[PDB]
């Protein structure tokens, strides 16, 4: 049941006629849910909690400015509008 | 064949135990009662070098050459290697030495210290050391450094080489270690002297760079002369190389008869661990005795002037003595002893020791053909 690539798992889900379910990261599931032919969906809640971060070398002079910049972008709603832009505004399955 | 052969000895500073082993080995050969084992008497003329004044080194070498010797056992360092090697090669006088093997292919000198190059390369290949920090000094030659560079080029390694020979401040060592840990370097190959290795280990202990996540490969014979207690208690992997086996019956007998010697007559013997250079000295005495016994057996006519003669005519019996010294296959405290055409050891086994919290354990052995058969 393990697949070599995510695309293989998505194709297996689509061709199994409902007899295969793929376990994958929620972000990529939500992205694939907005792509043609619009025949897959995300069900249930997340099984754990993870976060994507911006990474810098240990001891870098950019670590604190980058952390503060990410925080500013979070409270200005820019992260949310970027995710909306690249997931749903450019989605090809509609709202 | 002469009834009494006299050799020369060139001992530098901090060689008290080596001199004691030399005297004890000559005495052991002399006190043998078997006529076949002792067909001649062996005498020695011992001189102490300075290693910083080439004039004094040349004076001692020429005094030994003028008093009349058939072979010259001795030690050299990076400051006295060239003079002794060149004089021995030009005057056709054999130089049996436990010191580091000469980088260049030169004649009339027998370096019976097995090269760590092959063992180090085999251990790096076996341990998957595709990225490590090579801390080296040039006090024992450039063969190991050149071999590491060539192996890194061929195998596409990620060796970061640092020359710590000229470092005189421990803060430089601490800065180097901190910088290397910033890049997540967990493997260190330290090809340095015993004291420099001790200093580096003290710095890694001070910085706490000795937990179970670090591996240190000490590329230096003399694994028993390195202070390793604190690094052992830390839990870091330690790999070392040795040439003397404590379970060898010959070594056991030598130690049994060696720790029962008068301190005032054989200094640094009883209340002192046996250095591998002492074993090399004893095996060199064995090699010289075997070679001259072979020369007597074959009825080879062997039987002095000044160093600086223009032209320098060599005494013709040196070729036969060198050939006899380079064909010996003898079992000594370091195991099998054979030499090639350049006087370097062949068929030598280097014991690889892996050291853990319980103690040092013999992880295996390396040979030129079997290539580090594990245990």
């Amino acid at each position: 049941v393990f697949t070599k690539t995510t695309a293989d798992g998505v194709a297996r889900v689509r061709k199994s006629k409902g007899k295969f379910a793929f376990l994958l990261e929620s972000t990529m599931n939500e992205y694939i849910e907005q792509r043609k032919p619009c025949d897959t969906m995300k069900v249930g809640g997340n099984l754990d909690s993870k976060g994507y971060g911006v990474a810098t070398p240990k001891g870098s002079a950019l670590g604190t400015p980058v952390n503060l910049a990410v925080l500013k972008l979070s409270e200005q709603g820019i992260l949310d509008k970027l995710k909306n832009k690249w997931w749903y505004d450019k989605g090809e399955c509609g709202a | 064949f002469p009834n009494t052969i006299s050799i020369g000895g060139l001992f530098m500073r901090n060689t008290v135990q080596e001199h004691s082993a030399f005297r004890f080995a000559v005495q052991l050969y002399n006190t043998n009662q078997n006529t076949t084992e002792k067909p001649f008497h062996l005498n020695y003329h011992v001189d102490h070098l300075d290693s910083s004044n080439s004039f004094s080194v040349t004076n001692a070498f020429c005094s030994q050459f003028s008093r009349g010797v058939y072979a010259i056992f001795g030690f050299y360092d990076q400051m006295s290697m060239n003079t002794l090697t060149s004089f021995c090669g030009a005057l056709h006088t054999s130089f049996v030495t436990p010191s580091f093997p000469t980088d260049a292919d030169v004649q009339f000198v027998i370096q019976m210290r097995p090269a760590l190059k092959g063992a180090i390369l085999s251990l790096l290949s076996y341990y998957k050391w595709e990225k490590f920090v090579y801390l080296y000094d040039t006090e024992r030659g450039f063969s190991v450094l050149q071999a590491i560079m060539e192996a890194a080029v061929q195998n596409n390694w990620q060796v970061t080489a640092r020359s710590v020979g000229n470092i005189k401040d421990v803060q430089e060592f601490r800065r180097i270690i901190e910088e290397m840990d910033r890049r997540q370097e967990k493997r260190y190959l330290i090809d340095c002297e015993v004291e420099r290795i001790n200093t580096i280990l003290e710095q890694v202990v001070i910085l706490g760079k000795h937990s179970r996540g670090y591996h240190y490969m000490l590329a230096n014979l003399g694994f028993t002369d390195i202070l390793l207690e604190r690094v052992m208690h830390g839990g870091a992997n330690i790999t070392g190389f040795q040439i003397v086996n404590n379970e060898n019956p010959m070594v056991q007998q030598f130690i049994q008869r060696w720790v029962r010697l008068d301190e005032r007559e054989f200094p640094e013997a009883k209340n002192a661990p046996l250095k591998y250079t002492s074993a090399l000295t004893h095996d060199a005495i064995l090699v010289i005795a075997e070679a001259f016994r072979y020369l007597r057996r074959q009825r080879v006519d062997v039987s002095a002037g000044d160093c600086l003669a223009n032209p320098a005519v060599p005494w013709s019996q040196g070729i036969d003595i060198e050939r006899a010294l380079k064909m010996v296959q003898v079992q000594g405290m370091t195991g099998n002893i054979q030499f090639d055409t350049y006087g370097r050891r062949t068929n030598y086994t280097i014991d690889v020791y892996e050291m853990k919290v319980s103690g040092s354990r013999k992880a295996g052995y390396w040979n030129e053909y079997e290539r580090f058969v594990p245990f």
Partner: protein
């Protein structure tokens, strides 16, 4: 400033006619926009990681690959879907 990223939609993409495009203008996606905003707040040059991996430690040789290895060994910031994990945070 070298910014290491990974080609994974919708985070980093090639634009449709990136043959005529050059530099950073041949890239599109979420992480390109995020890097632009971070650069405004805090100059750079996107560098798609060569081996195409996120970053992991080899158990045998202890070498970091991917973007984490690009950061550790001084070749690159990493604006990409890189999960915050205990092993990476060290």
């Amino acid at each position: 400033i070298v910014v290491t990223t990974i080609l994974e939609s919708p985070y980093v993409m090639y634009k449709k006619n990136h043959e005529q495009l050059e530099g950073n203008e041949r890239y599109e996606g979420y992480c390109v926009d995020l890097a632009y905003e971070i650069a405004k707040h805090v100059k750079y040059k996107l560098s798609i990681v060569g081996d195409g991996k996120y970053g992991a430690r080899d158990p045998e040789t202890k070498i970091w690959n991917g973007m984490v290895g690009e950061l550790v060994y001084g070749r690159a910031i990493a604006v990409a879907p890189l999960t915050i994990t205990l092993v990476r945070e060290e």
